[PDB]
Amino acid sequence: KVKQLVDKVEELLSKNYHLVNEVARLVKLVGER
């Protein structure tokens, strides 16, 4: 179950990294206009 949890941590981190990339993409468009 440790391996299961490590996998879950990794999946969550990937999800969160995408969302940070989204914040970066969107904030540049507020800045832009």
Binding site: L5, L12, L13, N16, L19, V23, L26, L29
Partner: protein, 34 residues
């Protein structure tokens, strides 16, 4: 004890996810993205 500590890590990354979802939605609304 690795299990309890990793469970706590997962819960906190879920809070992170919740917050980031809120921020992303708020910025999409600002730029008119839907």
């Amino acid at each position: 004890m690795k299990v309890k500590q990793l469970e706590d890590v997962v819960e906190e990354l879920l809070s992170v996810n919740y917050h980031l979802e809120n921020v992303v939605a708020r910025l999409k609304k600002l730029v008119g993205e839907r």
